[PDB]
Structure formats: structure tokens, C-alpha cells
Write a protein that binds this DNA or RNA. Structure first.
Lengths: 103, 455, 50, 125, 176, 57, 48, 76, 198
RNA sequence: UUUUUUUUUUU
RNA sequence: UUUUUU
RNA sequence: UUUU
RNA sequence: UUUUU
RNA sequence: UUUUUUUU
């Protein structure tokens, strides 16, 4: 939790903007594409510390869904959240693929 | 006119306060970037682009905070400069529309039955070619000598008339000057004295003017402000007095004090207005000789005209019984009057033994936190420091509130009342937000107790 | 000359000035000199001389 | 970014006339701002290194104190309304890195944009 | 100079020098524009010297032209660009029938004659407190400079604006 | 102030006074002495006086 | 501004730098004289 | 939650109230009706000066309501 | 080193001040006294009379111009005079035996001593209106509270320099009176931050 | 520590 | 209860 | 209560 | 508590 | 000039 005066500093606002995306979108790279029509997207987030005034990074691995199964391992993609639960692990939907690794 | 409903009067004060805080913009010009900049190419390109951003920054008012998302705002602050016309700078269209209906969007007339006909303050051109373009005695305010160096209303008048008018002016002054010398020599400051008058028939200056008086006026740089005001009153009174037993009663004094001798629309204005009324009534006269029953003021300047009107209002007060205001707290006290008889024995406890008095307990606080949460927080229900407003002024005879009264009394912390980087407050749409469709919808949340205390 | 006098004594419209340096003022000059008749108009003086 | 912080050691010398400095794109832009204020007599890119002259007055140099705020391991950012509180009642020179190039602290407040405090020149506490 | 007598003499030299330079420059420009529009032999001379700089072998001596008598007065005639012509062509551009200037030259320089501008001698400022100290500071506006006058001065001294104008003319000459 | 201004060659003025250390009026060019023996020679060479910008002169 | 001078039929309008912009030597002649003066001052004062 | 008062020898002396007032705007303002309203000095007391009283008086009166490029410049 | 013959320079600021070892030296200073008490008591009666006679002809401002008195100072003369006379006519108590704080008692002694040495003033000597002048009034006068800076730094150049950012007025809440009755007082709360006027 | 005031930077 | 004192 |  | 010496 | 300096 952040105090009222902690929500107006440039350090916190800058971190917020980086994390914040349209439709709560995220950026990550796929690390597992073994199961059919399934890909695990590894997203990286950021956080601010009001004590030492330094920002660190922590990975957030999540599961996604692909229709055409165009994405492959080691390919940065875009994910979008959803207001339901489908499958045991599936919690995201693909939109597009930015980069493609050769084979 | 004559707002009788309480709601109409309440809204009048709101517009007055907002108008004072509103200030029109003043975009400043920006110099062109220099082409032969000695800086490196990397810095030269950045500097050239930044110049254009500043130009549009001060010429692009921003919309309401609620329009765009929070995220958008943060990115814009770090990508573009800050505009000079924030949404919380000028009033919206709602304020302008209200003034149209309330009636806030010939100036004054002081009428006295029996003494003075009318006192119209209509402002317009004098020699442009009825209210303000028919009289028989025109006024003039030349320099102490008979030669105007520059400026002055009379400079134009004299030149317009040509040599025909000028010849008559120099003859009249010559005879008057000689008479003073002989009169002051046979019976026993060789220059003129402020307060003299000279008559000059019109020579085609204005078809609708018969006479043209020449009243000298003093300077303002001599002495302090207190002495300058005293000098102007003496000239005014003498001028008016002489005019009385001169001819028909029709005064067309445009504006005295204006020109190049130093003028003050605030102070000088009150002198003139206040002087006019006395002439009409002829207070300072043992033998009343009602000759002068028409006084008017003419001003070309719009700004000045407006100001003049204000003075008129003040003049009307404290003179006519129909416009005598009185504070409400004292008005009611004066109505329920009683005669109380106090005997000698009733003042026994009033007297005291000690002669002097002073505070016997220092106001030094012991506990800053314990006292604050016991006798400060409970007694504070607002997030802003507001002082007691002034009392309401009511009439004496009718006993109804008047239109013009004292203004608001805004308070500022430490005296400073200037903000360079005002934030985007959320108070523009209380309990209202924008939906996905674009419509206006309400909210259900507890308001912040320190919303106004966190600018 | 006008600028130098302004700094030494602030004076203009709506302000009480000392009147030092103005054409219409007497000063204790070291030697006699004629008044400053340059600011007077030429049309009114010529017609008034006759 | 690392090479930027290496310029303070070379420019902060008393008994010297000219000192070398590694060549960098960002370093070239910084020297331009300092020369405008009259802190550096001049500089020249000698290829792999930049030769920067030193200014002196009555023995003592014009530069007496250098403070590095920004570091490669982190990033200091201040809002337009917060920079004024930090910088007040002082004659110091703060290098601000805004989106529209590099400018001093005085110009950053004029535009009202959020800059980045890089280094301090002639600064006290 | 140090003495009063010596200091006064310096004023005389400065007064005559300031007037002579103004007249010399004014007449110098008059002969420069007319020569370039009438003398046709100047084209050969310019190319001969330009080509000879690289090597003497490319330098050639042109024939110039046969000497002819002249009035030696037409090259020093005043020239003006004024619209009023109700007096039977009072000015009519440079001379009565001399070469004319382009319409685009009526923006920066209203007249072709070389005049003198009243350049300031003190620095400008933006703070109200500092503007009161500038000598040229009128109280009727609160500013120490005229924005309209200074706007045109900056445009004249601008290399970026001149490059665009020069490039446009070059393309027209090459194409047609 | 006198130290920084000399090397900084930039506005280094205070708030109360106005341009006290930087303002250097030309006291050896404008107030130059002039004698009546040589004044008549410069009247026909200098620009004639045709201006209106000074009243207190 | 306006400056008086010996009456000789002269009417000249000078600029700030000391350069004249309009030099003067049934009712058509009178109107033309004033028309040239209004446009002359605006030519060297207007900014497009 | 405090009542300041003197607690020293100087217990009875003139204590005038001071209200600091900096410049309202740094832009150059023109003269209103010929009367200059520019700021002369930064030191301002609580009492309003007559020069400033004119500007504020007029403020309330104002109502809220209301080819080549070089060749083209000369042509227009 | 520089020429600046004026009375608003850094060294000329706060003239006749101890700068050095003379700060600790004891020095006597004149004792201040309000203007409304230095005037002749006789004239106070006269002034009061006029005011109470005809407020219209003898307004608060016009009356103070003849005698050279400020609008605020003249108001106190009538108020202080009224109470003194009221207790005498009604035979309530004498002015000397009147109860008052110690701050006024010392003031009365100074007023009597001021006249015993010099004498009462027949006419006031003060300006009705203020004048913008360079003077030292406290420590809050020579400071900029908007930008919070003491030293202004600007670029030196002959060409026009871009102007600075102008400040905006501070919007604060105020109160006004609409209806006033003996048994109730209604007031309205104004919020300038509200976009909708209604 | 304000007579007629419930107003007052009282000091 | 005395002394001083526009 | 030198305002219960 | 008492109260014009 | 008032039981003023003077003090439950």
C-alpha cells in the first residue's frame, strides 16, 4: 500500500505508466509451447521502493491461449486478460505476435 | 431588475467573485531560433524542435481532467510541456449564460425634485458632429499659460477654430491681466491664479454650442497627494460659483483634471461628482439665486466612463433618504428602542478594585497533539480556512436588502496568493464521471475529508 | 538626459515629482540662461505676437 | 551513461590547463550547456578522446564543487512542482535531461515539463 | 586624450568620419546594382578569374569592350520604391526608366536605399524590475523593445530562410 | 556575486537592487566636455535636431 | 504625433530612423493627398 | 491552537501587520487610460497602493463575455 | 569599478545601519506614537462635531483632506471622542478612573510627555494615499514567495529573450450573506472550483 | 483589551 | 497618617 | 463571577 | 465571606 | 489637577 503523498512523486508515476497498458495488456516471451493450443508467456513487471528510491524487476510467468498456434518458443507476444476462467491453466488470449524466431 | 427572489440574489454574488479572479490571457511572442547556432548538430536539432512546442503550449487550452484516462495524463506530462491555460483558469459557458438572463450583460442620472433638474453622466463625443449634444456653455481646461505644449483636449479645439477664435482668446486674456495689475497697484505674484474664468463666444467650433468658457486648472506634481486634492476642490468650487451669476444654466464640463497635469480616475473622480451636487443646492450661499440647474459630464474614453458611473452611485448614497443603507445588525436594534432607567444602586457590581488589566494566563500550548484532537478537530468541519463574511446591508425606510454592497473577503496563507503549477483537481464534476458511451454518470464513494486541504 | 533624471527621482503621471529638470521650473544655475521655450507651440506664439 | 560520470574527475582539477575525456555522444551535448554559462573556456574532439580546457580566475578555478545525482544503477525524476522546492535560494547549475533535448534547470521550470536531474555544478548542500 | 583641449579635438574627427562613410556606402550600392544589370562584359571577367585559380592554364584574357564616352552621372542616381504616382510618375521605381526590383523585396526593405538602423546599446531583459533600468524603456507599454520592429530584424539575419530562397531560384534557372 | 558574475558573464543580480554591478553607463562618451569655441563647427556637420522623446531635458 | 513649424505649405511624415515616407510638394485632389498618407504609414508598419 | 504574544521586555510597541505581495505577472502591461500601472519596487506593505487600486478596479468591470513563401508575404 | 549614483543599490540599501562592530553598541531610538493622539485635543472636538452634524456635506474622506488626515485615522478620532463624552454627560465615571489595559496606560503617559517637551500638533502631517517607494518593511519584503528564489539568473543577449511563466491566482472558498433575520442568519458557500454554476 | 454592532488583524 | 508632583 |  | 475610606 | 506617582 502507498500513502497519499507517495502517489504524486515522479518515481511512482513513471513506474505506473510502464506497467499500465491499454486493456490491461502485457508484454512477454513464450517459454513453453508443448501442450496443444497452449503457450506460457513470461511477462516482466516493475515496482517502486520509497525507502532507497530504486526500481527492480521481477518475472511473472502466465499461461495464454492461441487459436492458430502461430507463436513458438522464444517469441515475444502480446496478451490480453479475460473476465472468466477457461481450462485448468489457460487464463489469457493472444492478439498478435511481434517477433518470430527462425524455426 | 429588482431581484426579489432569494435565489436570484444569491447567484449574483457568485458571479461577482468569479469575475475578479478571471484574468484574460496575454500570449507573449517567441523569438525565432538562430540558424548559425554554434552548438553541436545533435543539440541544434533538439533546440529547434523545442521552440515550436512552446508556441503551441500557450495557445492550446487543455480539457477537463475527466476526459482522458489517468495514464494518458502521466505520459503527456513527460512528453509535452505544460499549457498556460489550464481548465481551472477561466469560467465556463454556464457563467456567461447566467449573466444574460440576470440583466448584467445613458449610464447614471441623479435627479433632485426642486433644486436640480437632472445630472446625466452620458459619455460620448463632444465635437462628433437631446442628452449630450445640446448646451449653451462649453468648458475647457488649458495649461496655466496661454500656450499648450502638447496633449490636452483644448489643443484640438483651439486649432479647429482657426485664427478667428484664437484672436478673441488673446484679446480677452490681455484685458483681464491688465486690470489685475492696476487694481493691485493703486490701492498699494505677478502671474495668474488658479480659479479664474474667461468667456469666449464660439466661432464655428460646434453649431450646438453658444459660449466657450476658459477655466484654468492647477498641476498635480506640486505637493503630496493630500495637498493635490485640496487644490482641486478650491478650483472647482470657485469655477462653479462664478458660472452661476454668469448666464443661462447649462454646464457641459466634459472632464476636469484629465490631460497632462496628472489625473486619478479613482480619487479625482470623487471630487468632481461631490462638487456638482453642492452647486445645485447652493449650500454655501446666504442669498439663494437659482440660475444653474443643469450639470452634465462627457467622456470619450469607455474605461473612464464606466468608472465615472461608480462615483455617481456613491454620491447618491448618504444624500437622498431613499438610498440610505444601514447594516442589518444595527437596523433591527434601532427599531425596538426602549427607555431604561438605571439608578445609582444598580452600578454597584460594575465597579472593580484593580485599576489595570491584562492576560493572567499565557496562551502557550502544552500538548500539541492532545489539544488538537480534543478542541480543534471536532470544531472543524471544512477543509478550507474561511473567515466570517461581512454583514448584509439593508435599507432604512423600506427595510429591504440593497443591490450594491461590500465584496467577498478571500483569505490567503502567508499573504502569498500565487500558484505557478496548479494541479488538476477533481472537483469540477462532483459525483459525476464519464461512461464508455460518453454519457455522464454518478458515483457512490465517501468524499475525502482533506480534499481541499491537499492542493 | 531624461533617463538619467528618471532614475535619480521617480516621477511621471499620477506621481508626486520634485519638478527638477522640467522646462517649467526655476533652478539655481551657476550662470544666467534663457528659459526652455522649445516645447511651446509655434503657431500660437506667432499669431499672438501681433 | 557510465562515461558521463567520468567527466567530473577530469574537469575538477586545480593545477592543470587541459584534460582529456573519453569520446561520447551524450558527453558532447553536456559541454555545450556549460560553455554557455561561462564555465568552460573550450573543448575539442581529438578522435578517441576529447580535450577540454580549464578556466581559472585569480588562481582558483571557476568550478569548485561537482555533485553527481543520476547514476547508471538508478534514475532520479522530479515533477515540475517538485524541482522548485529542491532548487531554491541558490546559484547552482543543475543539468536537466528533458524529452526535447538537454537544458538547464531554469528552462525546465519555464516549460513545465518533467526533466531528469543529471548532475550539479557549483552546488552546496 | 587626457586634457579638455585634446578631448574636444577627438569629437571633430569622429563627426566627419561618421558622415563620410555614410555617403561612400550609399553611393557604392547605387553603382553596384546598375553595373550588374547593364554591363555585359562583367560575365567574362568573373569566369576567367574563377577558372584561373585552379591553374594558370585555364586563365584566359577576354577582349573586354571598346572604350566609349559616358556621362559618369547615371550610375550615381537615387533610387526609390514608392507607390504614389499621381504626380506623373514622380518616382517610378529606380530612376524614370531604370531597372526595377522584384515585388517580393517590399517586405524586409521598404526602400532600396541604404539607411541606418537605431541599434540598441544595452542588453534586454524579461523581468519587470530589470526593464526599468534600460535607457530605451517607455512607460506607455512596459517593454524595452518593439516586437514589430524586432520581428523583421531576426528574419533578415537567418541562414536557414536564405537557403530556401536561394534554392528555389536555382531550380528555376536550371529548369528554365 | 562579484566573483561569480565576473567569470559567469551573465545576469547575477539580487532582488532588491536593479543592475548595480553590471550597469556601466558610458561616462566618458556622453558627458564629454564641449567648449564654445568648437561648438559652432559641429553644428553644420552633425544631424539636425528633429526628435521628440525628452521632456525633462 | 504632431509637430508645428513655420507655415509654408509643408507636409512631411518621418519615421523612427529618420526617413521620410511621404513628402508633399474639384475635391478629387484633396482626397488623393490623404489616401497616399494612410497607406504609406501602413506599408512600413504592417506585418503579414 | 496557539495564541502568540510577547514574553520579553518589549511588551508594548507598535506591531504593524505585513502582507508580502510579489509581482502579479512578469509580462509587460500597458498603461490604463494613460496611467502607468507597472511595478516599480518589489517591497509592498499590507495597505494597497493607489497605483494598484486602479488595475484591480478595472478588472471587475471587464465582463466574461467576449513558388516561394517570401513572394506570398509581399503579395498579401 | 562601476558607476551607479542612486539610492537603491546594494550598499545603499538600509542606509544608516550598523555593519560591523557597531551592532552591539547601545543606541537610543525615537519612540513611536499614533497620529490620532498627537493632534491637538481641541481640534478633535471640532472634527467630531462636524461629523455628527452633517455626515453628507462632511464626509469621512472630505473632512480628512482639509486637516491632512487619513481615512482610517479620522475614524478613530470620532469613536474615541464619543465614548469620553458619553461618560461625562451621563455622570457615570471620570476618564481618569476608567478601567483599561496596561498597554493604553503607558500610551497615555507618552502622549502627555510628548506635548510637555515639544507640544501638541495643530495640524496632522501625513499623506492620504500611499506611494510606491523603495523602503525596507520587515524581512518578508525583499523575498519572492512565488518562485521561492533570492537571486535571479538570466541569459545575457541583445536579442529578445523569451518571457517567463506568469503565475495564476489562488482559488479559495469564501462566504456571502443572502438573507438576514433577527432569529436566523442564512449564508451561501461559494465554490469557485465548481464548473457548473447553476 | 470596541457604549449605543451580532461587524473590527483590537495589541 | 509621610514625601514628590501640569 | 469582577456576567449563574 | 464582607464592601464607596 | 483626577482620592496622580502608589503596589490584597
Amino acid at each position: 500500500h502507498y500513502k497519499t503523498w507517495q502517489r504524486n512523486t515522479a518515481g511512482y508515476l513513471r513506474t505506473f505508466m510502464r506497467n499500465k497498458l491499454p486493456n490491461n495488456e502485457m508484454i512477454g516471451y513464450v517459454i513453453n509451447d508443448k501442450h496443444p493450443k497452449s503457450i506460457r508467456v513470461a511477462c516482466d513487471r516493475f515496482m517502486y521502493v520509497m525507502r532507497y528510491k530504486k526500481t527492480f524487476r521481477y518475472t511473472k510467468k502466465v499461461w495464454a491461449h492461441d487459436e492458430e498456434s502461430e507463436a513458438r518458443l522464444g517469441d515475444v507476444v502480446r496478451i490480453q486478460p479475460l473476465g472468466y476462467r477457461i481450462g485448468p491453466w489457460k487464463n489469457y488470449v493472444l492478439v498478435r505476435v511481434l517477433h518470430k524466431e527462425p524455426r | 431588475r429588482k431581484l426579489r427572489l432569494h435565489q436570484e440574489r444569491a447567484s449574483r454574488g457568485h458571479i461577482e467573485y468569479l469575475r475578479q479572479l478571471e484574468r484574460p490571457p496575454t500570449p507573449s511572442p517567441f523569438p525565432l531560433p538562430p540558424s548559425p547556432s554554434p552548438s553541436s548538430p545533435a543539440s541544434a536539432a533538439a533546440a529547434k524542435a523545442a521552440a515550436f512546442a512552446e508556441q503551441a503550449a500557450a495557445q492550446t487550452p487543455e480539457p477537463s481532467v475527466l476526459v482522458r484516462s489517468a495514464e494518458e495524463w502521466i505520459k503527456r506530462d513527460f512528453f509535452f510541456p505544460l499549457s498556460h491555460q489550464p481548465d481551472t483558469a477561466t469560467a465556463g459557458e454556464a457563467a456567461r449564460a447566467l449573466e444574460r438572463e440576470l440583466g448584467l450583460s445613458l449610464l447614471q442620472q441623479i435627479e433632485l425634485p426642486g433644486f436640480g433638474e437632472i445630472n446625466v453622466v452620458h459619455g460620448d463625443l463632444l465635437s462628433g458632429s437631446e442628452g449630450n449634444v445640446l448646451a449653451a456653455d462649453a468648458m475647457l481646461v488649458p495649461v496655466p499659460p496661454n500656450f499648450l505644449p502638447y496633449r490636452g483636449f483644448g489643443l484640438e479645439v483651439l486649432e479647429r477654430g482657426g485664427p478667428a477664435l484664437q484672436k478673441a482668446a488673446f484679446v480677452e486674456v490681455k484685458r483681464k491681466l491688465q486690470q489685475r495689475e492696476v487694481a493691485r497697484d493703486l490701492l498699494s505674484e505677478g502671474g495668474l491664479d488658479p480659479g479664474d474664468l474667461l468667456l469666449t463666444p464660439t466661432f464655428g467650433v460646434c453649431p450646438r454650442v453658444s459660449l466657450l468658457a476658459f477655466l484654468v486648472t492647477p498641476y498635480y506634481w506640486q505637493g503630496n497627494s493630500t495637498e493635490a486634492a485640496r487644490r482641486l476642490r478650491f478650483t472647482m468650487r470657485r469655477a462653479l460659483d462664478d458660472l452661476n451669476r454668469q448666464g443661462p444654466g447649462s454646464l457641459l464640463l466634459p472632464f476636469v483634471g484629465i490631460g497632462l497635469y496628472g489625473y486619478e480616475p479613482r480619487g479625482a473622480a470623487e471630487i468632481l461628482v461631490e462638487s456638482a451636487v453642492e452647486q445645485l443646492l447652493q449650500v454655501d450661499a446666504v442669498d439663494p439665486n437659482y440660475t444653474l440647474r443643469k450639470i452634465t459630464f462627457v467622456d470619450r474614453d469607455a474605461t473612464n466612463a464606466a468608472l465615472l458611473a461608480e462615483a455617481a452611485q456613491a454620491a447618491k448614497r448618504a444624500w437622498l433618504p431613499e438610498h440610505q443603507v444601514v447594516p442589518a445588525p444595527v437596523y433591527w436594534s434601532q427599531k425596538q428602542r426602549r427607555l431604561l432607567d438605571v439608578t445609582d444602586g444598580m452600578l454597584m457590581f460594575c465597579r472593580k478594585h484593580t485599576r489595570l488589566s491584562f492576560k493572567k494566563h499565557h496562551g502557550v500550548i502544552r500538548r500539541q497533539k492532545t489539544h488538537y484532537f480534543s478542541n480543534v478537530r471536532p470544531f472543524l468541519w471544512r477543509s478550507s480556512r474561511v473567515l466570517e463574511p461581512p454583514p448584509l446591508l439593508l435599507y432604512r425606510h423600506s427595510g429591504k436588502p440593497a443591490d450594491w454592497q461590500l465584496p467577498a473577503r478571500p483569505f490567503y496563507r502567508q499573504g502569498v496568493s500565487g500558484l505557478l503549477f496548479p494541479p488538476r483537481l477533481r472537483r469540477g464534476f462532483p459525483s459525476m464521471r464519464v461512461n464508455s458511451k460518453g454519457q455522464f454518470v454518478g458515483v457512490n464513494k465517501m468524499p475525502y475529508i482533506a480534499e481541499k486541504a491537499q492542493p | 538626459t531624461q533617463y538619467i533624471l528618471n532614475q535619480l527621482d521617480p516621477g511621471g503621471a499620477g506621481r508626486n515629482c520634485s519638478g527638477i529638470g522640467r522646462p517649467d521650473v526655476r533652478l539655481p544655475l551657476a550662470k544666467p540662461a534663457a528659459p526652455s521655450t522649445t516645447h511651446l507651440p509655434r503657431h500660437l506664439v506667432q499669431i499672438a505676437r501681433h | 551513461m557510465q562515461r558521463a560520470c567520468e567527466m567530473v574527475v577530469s574537469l575538477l582539477r586545480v593545477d592543470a590547463l587541459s584534460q582529456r575525456c573519453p569520446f561520447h555522444v551524450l558527453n558532447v551535448q553536456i559541454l555545450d550547456l556549460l560553455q554557455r554559462e561561462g564555465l568552460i573556456r573550450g573543448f575539442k574532439v581529438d578522435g578517441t578522446k576529447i580535450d577540454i580546457l580549464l578556466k581559472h580566475y585569480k588562481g582558483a578555478p571557476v568550478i569548485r564543487n561537482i555533485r553527481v545525482v543520476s547514476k547508471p544503477s538508478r534514475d532520479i525524476w522530479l515533477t515540475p512542482h517538485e524541482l522548485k522546492f529542491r532548487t531554491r535560494f541558490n546559484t547552482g547549475l543543475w543539468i536537466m535531461q528533458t524529452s526535447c533535448g538537454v537544458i538547464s534547470h531554469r528552462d525546465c521550470l519555464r516549460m513545465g515539463i518533467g526533466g531528469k536531474m543529471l548532475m550539479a555544478i557549483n552546488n552546496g548542500y | 586624450p587626457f586634457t579638455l583641449q585634446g578631448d574636444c579635438r577627438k569629437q571633430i574627427l569622429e563627426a566627419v568620419e561618421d558622415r563620410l562613410v555614410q555617403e561612400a556606402l550609399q553611393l557604392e550600392l547605387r553603382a553596384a546594382l546598375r553595373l550588374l544589370a547593364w554591363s555585359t562584359d562583367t560575365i567574362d571577367g568573373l569566369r576567367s578569374e574563377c577558372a584561373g585559380r585552379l591553374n594558370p592554364e585555364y586563365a584566359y584574357r577576354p577582349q573586354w569592350k571598346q572604350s566609349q564616352r559616358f556621362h559618369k552621372e547615371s550610375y550615381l542616381t537615387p533610387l526609390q520604391d514608392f507607390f504614389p504616382t499621381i504626380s506623373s510618375s514622380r518616382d517610378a521605381a529606380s530612376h524614370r526608366a531604370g531597372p526595377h526590383i522584384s515585388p517580393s523585396c517590399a517586405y524586409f526593405f521598404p526602400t532600396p536605399e541604404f539607411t541606418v538602423t537605431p541599434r540598441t546599446f544595452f542588453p534586454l531583459s524579461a523581468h519587470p524590475l530589470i526593464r526599468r533600468i534600460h535607457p530605451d524603456f517607455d512607460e506607455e507599454t512596459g517593454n524595452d523593445h518593439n516586437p514589430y520592429a524586432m520581428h523583421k530584424l531576426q528574419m533578415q539575419w537567418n541562414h536557414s530562410l536564405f537557403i530556401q530562397e536561394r534554392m528555389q531560384a536555382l531550380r528555376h534557372f536550371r529548369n528554365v | 556575486r562579484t566573483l561569480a558574475n565576473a567569470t559567469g558573464q551573465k545576469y547575477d543580480l539580487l532582488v532588491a537592487p536593479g543592475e548595480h554591478w553590471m550597469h556601466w553607463p558610458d561616462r566618458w562618451f556622453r558627458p564629454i566636455s564641449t567648449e564654445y569655441a568648437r561648438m559652432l563647427e559641429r553644428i553644420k556637420k552633425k544631424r539636425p535636431p528633429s526628435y521628440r522623446r525628452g521632456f525633462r531635458a | 504625433a504632431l509637430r508645428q513649424e513655420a507655415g509654408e505649405g509643408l507636409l512631411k511624415i518621418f519615421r523612427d530612423d529618420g526617413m521620410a515616407v511621404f513628402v508633399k510638394d474639384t475635391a478629387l485632389a484633396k482626397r488623393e493627398a490623404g489616401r497616399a498618407a494612410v497607406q504609406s504609414i501602413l506599408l512600413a508598419c504592417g506585418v503579414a | 491552537a496557539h495564541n502568540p504574544l510577547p514574553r520579553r521586555y518589549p511588551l508594548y510597541k507598535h506591531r504593524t501587520l505585513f502582507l508580502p505581495l510579489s509581482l502579479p505577472s512578469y509580462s509587460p502591461q500597458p498603461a490604463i487610460s494613460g496611467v502607468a500601472v507597472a511595478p516599480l519596487t518589489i517591497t509592498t506593505n499590507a495597505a494597497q497602493l493607489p497605483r494598484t487600486l486602479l488595475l484591480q478596479s478595472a478588472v471587475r468591470q471587464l465582463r466574461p463575455l467576449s513558388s516561394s513563401w517570401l513572394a506570398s508575404l509581399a503579395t498579401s | 569599478q562601476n558607476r551607479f549614483p542612486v539610492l537603491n543599490t546594494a550598499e545603499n540599501f538600509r542606509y544608516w545601519k550598523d555593519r560591523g562592530l557597531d551592532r552591539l553598541l547601545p543606541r537610543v531610538f525615537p519612540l513611536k506614537l499614533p497620529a490620532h493622539r498627537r493632534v491637538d485635543p481641541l481640534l478633535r472636538e471640532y472634527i467630531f462635531f462636524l461629523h455628527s452634524m452633517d455626515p453628507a456635506r462632511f464626509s469621512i474622506r472630505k473632512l480628512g483632506e482639509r486637516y491632512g488626515l487619513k481615512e482610517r485615522t479620522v475614524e478613530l478620532i470620532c469613536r474615541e471622542f464619543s465614548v469620553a463624552e458619553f461618560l461625562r454627560r451621563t455622570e457615570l465615571a471620570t476618564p481618569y478612573t476608567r478601567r483599561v489595559s496596561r498597554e493604553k496606560a503607558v500610551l497615555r503617559m507618552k502622549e502627555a510627555l510628548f506635548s510637555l517637551k515639544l507640544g501638541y500638533d495643530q495640524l496632522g502631517d501625513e499623506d492620504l494615499d500611499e506611494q510606491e517607494e523603495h523602503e525596507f518593511r520587515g524581512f518578508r519584503s525583499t523575498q519572492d514567495w512565488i518562485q521561492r528564489q533570492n537571486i535571479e539568473v538570466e541569459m545575457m543577449s541583445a536579442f529578445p529573450l523569451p518571457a517567463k511563466r506568469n503565475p495564476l491566482p489562488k482559488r479559495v472558498d469564501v462566504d456571502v450573506t443572502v438573507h438576514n433575520t433577527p432569529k436566523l442568519k442564512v449564508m451561501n458557500w461559494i465554490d469557485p472550483n465548481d464548473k457548473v454554476v447553476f
